[PDB]
Amino acid sequence: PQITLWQRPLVTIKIGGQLKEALLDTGADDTVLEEMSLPGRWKPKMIGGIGGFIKVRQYDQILIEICGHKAIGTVLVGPTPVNIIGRNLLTQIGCTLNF
Amino acid sequence: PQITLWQRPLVTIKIGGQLKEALLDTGADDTVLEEMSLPGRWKPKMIGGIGGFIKVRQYDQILIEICGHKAIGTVLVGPTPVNIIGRNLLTQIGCTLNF
Numbered sequence: 357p358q359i360t361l362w363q364r365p366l367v368t369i370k371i372g373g374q375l376k377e378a379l380l381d382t383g384a385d386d387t388v389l390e391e392m393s394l395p396g397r398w399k400p401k402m403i404g405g406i407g408g409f410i411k412v413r414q415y416d417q418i419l420i421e422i423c424g425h426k427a428i429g430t431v432l433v434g435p436t437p438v439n440i441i442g443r444n445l446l447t448q449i450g451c452t453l454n455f
Numbered sequence: 456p457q458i459t460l461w462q463r464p465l466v467t468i469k470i471g472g473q474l475k476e477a478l479l480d481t482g483a484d485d486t487v488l489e490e491m492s493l494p495g496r497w498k499p500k501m502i503g504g505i506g507g508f509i510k511v512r513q514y515d516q517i518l519i520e521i522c523g524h525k526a527i528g529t530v531l532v533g534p535t536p537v538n539i540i541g542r543n544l545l546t547q548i549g550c551t552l553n554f
């Protein structure tokens with residue numbers, strides 16, 4: 357669909373059997389989700405942004421259904437204020453910026 | 456223009472007579488630019504990002520040219536790692552998301 361930016365671009369996602377709302381974020385290289393129950397082994401990674409850095413757990417090959425569209429990719433889980441869908445998943449659903 | 460997201464969506468901006476590159480960020484509510492020379496009075500303010508909170512200086516009614524698009528709005532200048540154009544300015548140059 358087409359989304360204007362008058363309000364935060366929130367979308368409904370489904371990961372690991374749970375329904376969550378996430379922010380379509382073009383300035384996020386990676387997808388980072390709030391702490392949640394996810395199965396599998398992970399790797400302790402670390403990312404930075406405004407305000408500093410955070411310790412995050414990296415899970416690969418995670419299936420996420422974003423607005424009905426499915427995608428499989430890396431998902432970071434950790435201390436995030438908002439669930440963020442970054443470019444690693446935004447490219448898989450064919451999301452573009454237009455002006 | 457149409458911007459695909461395989462690479463960070465960076466654009467050339469002209470502010471305060473200076474040329475800079477900035478990231479188009481749909482996940483950012485406001486525009487945050489690295490610390491730079493800007494004339495005028497400003498108000499102190501703090502921003503919350505992924506790693507914590509930074510204290511920035513707020514400038515109102517500042518002219519900024521993103522591409523050939525001129526826009527006037529609020530700009531926060533402070534310790535951000537990347538210059539980011541947020542939704543306060545993205546809506547003025549008519550930027551949308553599509554998938």
Ligand SMILES: CC(C)CN(C[C@@H](O)[C@H](Cc1ccccc1)NC(=O)O[C@H]1CCOC1)S(=O)(=O)c1ccc(N)cc1
Nearest residue numbers: 383384385386404405406437482483484485504505537
């Ligand atoms: C370009 C960078 C440095 C900024 N990031 C993207 C931004 O969209 C980020 C998204 C977000 C919104 C609200 C709360 C917390 C995070 N907004 C952000 O800082 O909002 C401030 C600036 C003005 O208004 C509020 S990031 O979150 O650090 C990030 C970095 C790496 C990955 N892999 C994932 C996320």
